[PDB]
């Protein structure tokens, strides 16, 4: 079996949309107290995602790979509103005040998720770092689509600008996962084992993060 | 004394334009054999400069600082022709063939320069990493200006597109040094000592690199 296929199968078999939290989201069975906690607890990962990308770029000598990593990073962090600003719009539309979000101390659940990504993105296998990111970003497009639906037919999201982060990631992360899948191939150095090891680790780590809100 | 002033004084007092190699350039007293060797030996630093920036960014939690680091990185590596492509144009206009440049193995002089930057950019002081980069980029604008002159009135540079790298850096690195000087302030964490330690180290390291061609 080809390792990219093995890679996708791992994510297919531990995919956040099958997690209770997002199933609960799908049927609507989630409190406003639970959403505001997740929106706040996600913020640490959202601020850190640029560093995941620059961590790999900064250890990379493939000049064409770096430009691809830069393209993701540029979409993440460049301009107003970058993806960080978009999340904030979602966090504030949920009801959270700016002060409360900035004063929020992230759960150790969330710190473990981030730390799992950073471990791979700073590790010794550039393809494993991209696989860590890929095992998340490739789920994102379908997650966003179903998350807009749940914000509409369940949580009173009238204004579209209130879930713009998810509208952007419905499309942005189709490109990103395609570029990451290509980056994994161009950076492979007889380490497809770490690619899958990273995939297993990130996907489970994401389950523990979702577990935290129950 | 203020440490940014101390910082500039260090660079003023070990500035590449005062080095024999660039004085020799200034009077024209440099062989085509010497320029093609320097153009080739510089290539390792030129390919690595993006990683210097992403190395600091990837360790940084100041969200406004990261966007500044990204702006430099974007000017360095984004688009055709990025700064790497521009150097190539200079390397090829000097007479070097593409194959010979890609087949060139960099001197240990050059490997020491790069390694000095990367040590600081991956070290434990974000302001020292920016100071390592600043102690180089702040010299660049005046270096470029005098290096265009020496390519014109000495080395037969007719076509302007042949020294476009230096035309770009005459202006680009005015902005970059101003943004880096500002980044050093925003990232200082009671470590102005490392800022100057880095400055001393980078500036000397640059002298040893220039020393290599004599
Ligand atoms: Fe994103
Ligand atoms: Fe993304
Ligand atoms: Fe540059
Ligand atoms: Fe620059």
Tags for this model:
214 residues, globular, mainly alpha, Heme Oxygenase, Chain A, 4-aminobenzoate synthase (chains A, B), PqqC-like (chains A, B), homodimer, binds fe (ii) ion, Haem_Oase-like_multi-hlx (chains A, B)
Structural account:
2 copies of one chain form a homodimer. Chain A has 214 residues and is an all-alpha fold. Chain A has helices at 3-12, 20-27, 32-41, 43-57, 63-77, 83-93, 98-103, 108-121, 126-137, 140-152, 164-187, 192-211. In chain A, helix 9 runs antiparallel to helix 11 (164-187) and helix 9 runs parallel beside helix 12 (192-211). The site of one fe (ii) ion has 4 residues of chain B, from helix 11.
> Which homologous superfamily in CATH is the superfamily of chain A?
Heme oxygenase-like
- Please state roughly what percent of the residues of chain A sit in beta strands, choosing from under 5%, 5-15%, 15-25%, 25-35%, 35-45% or over 45%: under 5%
Total separate domains of chain A? 1
Kindly state the number of beta strands of chain A. Answer: 0
Structural class of chain A: mainly alpha
The level 1 CATH classification of chain A is: Mainly Alpha
| Shape by Cα distribution of chain A | globular
CATH fold-type name of chain A: Heme Oxygenase, Chain A
Q: Report the CATH architecture of chain A.
A: Up-down Bundle
User: For the CA atoms, what is the radius of gyration of chain A?
Assistant: 17 Å
In quaternary terms, these chains amount to homodimer
């Amino acid at each position: 079996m080809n390792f990219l296929d093995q890679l996708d199968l791992i994510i297919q078999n531990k995919h956040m949309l099958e997690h209770t939290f997002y199933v609960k989201w799908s049927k609507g069975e989630l409190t406003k107290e639970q959403l505001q906690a997740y929106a706040k607890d996600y913020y640490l990962h959202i601020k850190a995602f640029p560093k995941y990308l620059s961590a790999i770029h900064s250890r990379c000598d493939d000049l064409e790979a770096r430009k691809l990593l830069l393209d993701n990073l540029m979409d993440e962090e460049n301009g107003y509103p970058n993806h960080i600003d978009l999340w904030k719009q979602f966090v504030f539309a949920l009801g959270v005040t700016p002060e409360e979000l900035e004063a929020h101390e992230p759960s150790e659940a969330a710190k473990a998720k981030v730390a799992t990504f950073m471990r791979w993105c700073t590790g010794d296998s550039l393809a494993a770092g991209v696989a860590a990111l890929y095992s998340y970003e490739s789920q994102i497009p379908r997650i966003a689509r179903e998350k807009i639906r749940g914000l509409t037919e369940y949580f009173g999201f009238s204004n579209p600008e209130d879930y713009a982060y998810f509208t952007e990631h419905e499309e942005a992360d189709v490109r990103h996962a395609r570029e990451e899948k290509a980056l994994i191939e161009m950076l492979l150095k007889d380490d497809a084992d770490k690619v899958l090891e990273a995939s297993q680790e990130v996907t489970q780590s994401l389950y523990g993060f979702l577990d935290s809100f129950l």
